[PDB]
Design a protein around this nucleic acid. Structure first.
Lengths: 142, 81, 129, 150
RNA sequence: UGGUUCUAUUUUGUUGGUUUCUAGGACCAUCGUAAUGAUUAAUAGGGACGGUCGGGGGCAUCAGUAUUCAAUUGUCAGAGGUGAAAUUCUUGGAUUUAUUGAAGACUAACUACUGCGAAAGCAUUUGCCAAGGACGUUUUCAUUAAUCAAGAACGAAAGUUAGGGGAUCGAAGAUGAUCAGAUACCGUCGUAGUCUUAACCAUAAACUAUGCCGACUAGGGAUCGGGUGGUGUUUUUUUAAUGACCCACUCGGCACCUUACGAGAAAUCAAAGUCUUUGGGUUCUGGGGGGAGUAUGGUCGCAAGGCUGAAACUUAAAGGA
RNA sequence: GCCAGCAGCCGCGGUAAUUCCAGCUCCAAUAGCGUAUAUUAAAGUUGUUGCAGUUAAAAAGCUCGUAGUUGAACUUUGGGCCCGGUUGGCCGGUCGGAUUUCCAACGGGGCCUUUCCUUCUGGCUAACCUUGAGUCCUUGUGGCUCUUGGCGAACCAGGA
């Protein structure tokens, strides 16, 4: 006689005692307050527009040393101030201050990647022309 | 035991086993036709009194009640039934 | 209490038989049960079984074979529609062939393969294998 | 297993099977009727009647010997009592306890037990609602028990 | 079969209104028609009964005994205390002894792989008070039951509120010791509290860190509670009677051993088994580590505090065997 | 020579650096490559199908409960006759498909065995229990032309 009511008329007490439970399970937490719209940068999104400030330097977390390349942004929305991260080379160079940049996630949700600490985004485009190209030289910049 | 007739076992195994399992339940207590010596009378008493009953009227005493079975006095034939 | 009957005795019958008891005794006797066994028996799963009355709700001996593999009571007693049993067999019968799921209609405190030849269905109490 | 403690008692009677007669007893059915109805006004309670009937005269249960069940009979004769007898010992216990709680407000065990007991009663009083044997509404009232018996 | 009651197509011009003709409603009695009509009674439940069982509860009595203290009673140097010490008591003759007393505190050994309770938790004795489990049951009612957001009892101790109690221990406070320091460990005293009445709080490693219902798998030998049987062991009294006992059996426990056919990260597990051959019933919970069960609001409390419960930021490990 | 610098993460670099700067050399995509962001699969790390909750992060302190959710079985089974579809064999019957006997599978309508088919007024009959006549041909339950008593659910259409 495990812990649940079982007979026939035990609809009522079931549609409640899952709907309570669900709570805790983290996911169903995000989706009811859902956080996504109020908290976090993109709100209910995937991508966005921003414009750079400084070119900050963030060393490592440690089993590592690794002085990586990050940029503060200004979005073109809530305004948060965010940092974000660059790929490939130096990549830095090609992000010349107060330029237009196109930001996206980091495929991890929330969370925070690899050897970087409070950091949660990547730089996809600039000006809107790739980075991918303004490192495999299929275009160049204005 | 891999097996057994539990229908009818021994008579043994019942006498000892508890009133309420001999299968079909049946009492142990039973009644007991008493000549106090004076009169011939015959009062139908029960093995477990709870009451002492008086004998018929002679005002006599008979059988005290205890845990289970009366203790009956000295005189009493106490033929069972 | 004892809140339900059929159950109680059944469980002891899958706890006699496991150990190799050749049989059983079970207390509260019903019609329900008498009928239940009378199905089981027809299908080759027990024998004889020697009601005993005592003017009471009564005791029933069930002589063994050592075939029984397993006869759980299901148990709200759900409802069921004809074409639905086709979900049950394969969620609690090893095969199909075989080994009867078992249910309660109107005739009938009678399995499903006989149910086809009748075309009837209601509520599903126990099941054998 | 007694509804109030940690206790799984077993002990009743192992009415015997025979429906009819004791046979060894050969006196009459009318005979014990008379006897009960003899007893009642005097000052009875059906519970006791049997005890007294059993220990002294032929009987074995009224039940064999007649086709009724004591009470039924008193009720025909009008001796049922205003109360269903088992109740009239519980309420009693109430008065008899509450009183004791009030000589010694510094007693808990007793307190609890009282409640417990208020409850035996409400439940048993809800039943002798239901089945037409307490004029509807009856409710039990703590304080009204002492001119209900003395 | 009346009656009753509604009508309102149809013809004695017809248009409308009495109201008689025929036809459809519907009903309470009524002679008649019927195998006249009510599922088992789940090894699901609830109940009654019967012997019972139990350190389950409360209210009262009852006894042990130590400790402390004081009297009485004696003798006469240190006693205490320790790893080793010193503070401490010592003609105001302690420490010891004798016996009686007083007080509040607890319930030794028995006492265990044992008892019962929903858990917390419960052991001197007896009397009321009502409760309850397990069996036994040719009693009963007949699907009433399983788990449960909401809601509502209980909840170790600590702690609080006001009275009572204030032996013993004994945070706090004071101390003497040790120690580079020692606000700690060691020693002696010590309010508060421990105890109880009445009211709060609701937390715990509240621990099997294992939700309950069920149903099925594989062997054992113990034990508590019942019950059944054996011209069973003693009791001896004359034979029985019971009773203890032995054994046989069982149902319900509280566990244990042994396997591993299974499961697992493993350690190990008769359940953590019947799960990629993936599904019997349902309630809670978690989704990297911290930040932090904090800040906030909202709420229960007199307060201590509880329940609710973020985010920014930071980080490549933290962890299990 | 732990400084420049690279490195999404593990990490190189503190005097011979397979990672930095650069030469040659090779590898991958290639008129197209990279780069950052968001989303997807990867994700059985949101899960109903498919998770985990003995100690990894998780079984509420324990019980009662109004909803919610599940809920033993039992109320025509069997047999009897039909008749036909269209897959599959056995003839291809023939200048690569047409169908019959032989004949397996398999559905499906009848009807009958005590057998509701809401059921009455017509019209409706559509079928044979009919049979007024009979016989092409294998010495006949193989083949369908015809009105008369009598089939109602092949169905119109008003109601109860």
């Amino acid at each position: 006689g495990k812990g649940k009511p079982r007979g026939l008329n035990s609809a009522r007490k079931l549609r409640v005692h899952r709907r309570n439970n669900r709570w805790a399970e983290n996911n169903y937490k995000k989706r009811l307050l859902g956080t996504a719209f109020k908290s976090s940068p993109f709100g209910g999104s995937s991508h966005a527009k921003g414009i750079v400030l400084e070119k900050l330097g963030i060393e490592s977390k440690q089993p590592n040393s690794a002085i990586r390349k990050c940029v503060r942004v200004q979005l073109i929305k809530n305004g948060k101030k965010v940092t974000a991260f660059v790929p490939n080379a130096g990549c830095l160079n090609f992000v010349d201050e107060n330029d237009e940049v196109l930001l996206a996630g980091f495929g991890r949700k929330g969370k925070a990647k690899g050897d970087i600490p409070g950091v949660r985004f990547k730089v996809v485009k600039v000006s809107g022309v790739s980075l991918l190209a303004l490192w495999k030289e299929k275009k160049e910049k204005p | 035991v891999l097996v057994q007739d539990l229908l009818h076992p021994t008579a043994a195994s019942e006498a000892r086993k508890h009133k309420l399992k001999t299968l079909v339940q049946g009492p142990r207590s039973y009644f007991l036709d008493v000549k106090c010596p004076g009169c011939l009378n015959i009062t139908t008493v029960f093995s477990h009194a709870q009451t002492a009953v008086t004998c018929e009227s002679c005002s006599t005493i008979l059988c005290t009640p205890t845990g289970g079975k009366a203790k009956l006095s000295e005189g009493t034939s106490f033929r069972r039934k | 209490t004892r809140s339900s009957v059929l159950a109680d005795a059944l469980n002891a019958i899958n706890n006699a038989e496991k150990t190799g008891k050749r049989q059983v005794l079970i207390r509260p006797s019903s019609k329900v049960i008498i009928k239940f066994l009378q199905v089981m028996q027809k299908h080759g799963y027990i024998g004889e079984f020697e009601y005993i009355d005592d003017h009471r709700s009564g005791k029933i001996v069930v002589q063994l074979n050592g075939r029984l593999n397993k006869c759980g009571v299901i148990s709200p007693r759900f409802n069921v529609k004809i074409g639905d049993i086709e979900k049950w067999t394969a969620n609690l019968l090893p095969a199909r062939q075989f080994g009867y799921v078992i249910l309660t209609t109107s005739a009938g405190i009678m399995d499903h393969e006989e149910a086809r030849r009748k075309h009837v269905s209601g509520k599903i109490l126990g099941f054998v294998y | 297993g007694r509804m109030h403690s940690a206790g799984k008692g077993i002990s009743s009677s192992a009415i015997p099977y025979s429906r009819n007669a004791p046979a060894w007893f050969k006196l009459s059915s009318e005979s014990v009727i008379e006897q009960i109805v003899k007893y009642a006004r005097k000052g009875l309670t059906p519970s006791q009647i049997g005890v007294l009937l059993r220990d002294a005269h032929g009987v074995t249960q009224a039940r064999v010997i007649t086709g009724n069940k004591i009470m039924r009979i008193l009720k025909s004769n009008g001796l049922a009592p205003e109360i269903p007898e088992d109740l009239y010992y519980l309420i009693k216990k109430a008065v008899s306890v509450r009183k004791h709680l009030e000589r010694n407000r510094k007693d808990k065990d007793a307190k609890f037990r009282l409640i417990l007991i208020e409850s035996r009663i409400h439940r048993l009083a809800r039943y002798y609602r239901t089945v037409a044997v307490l004029p509807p509404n009856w409710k039990y009232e703590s304080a009204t028990a002492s001119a209900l018996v003395n």
